[PDB]
């Protein structure tokens with residue numbers, strides 16, 4: 027598995043972003059890699 | 062390889078946790094993903 | 097894919113280091129995992 031790229035979906039505690047992106051909520055259920 | 066999940070074993074500098082978990086020592090030799 | 101090990105090449109936003117290493121520029125184009 028790879029670190030998640032910019033603007034792609036991530037899951038805290040399960041599937042995280044490539045640094046320096048941060049996994050941020052974008053709605054009630056989903057998160058995206060932002061930064 | 063995947064990021065390490067909650068309460069599973071991690072190794073600093075070698076096998077790290079899924080954010081926002083942190084790899085913490087739990088005894089003399091082992092580390093676990095906590096948070 | 098795995099997190100990048102100490103003194104190996106990394107790419108911010110694409111191929112990141114094993115914590116607690118940080119991906120730092122080492123010249124105009126390349127980055128390395130330091131820490």
Ligand code: NI
Pocket residue numbers: 029042064077099112
């Ligand atoms: Ni990672």
Ligand code: NI
Pocket residue numbers: 045046047048080
């Ligand atoms: Ni981070």
Ligand code: NI
Pocket residue numbers: 080081082083115
């Ligand atoms: Ni961290």
Ligand code: NI
Pocket residue numbers: 027028062063097098
């Ligand atoms: Ni992998």
Ligand code: NI
Pocket residue numbers: 045115116117118
């Ligand atoms: Ni970091």
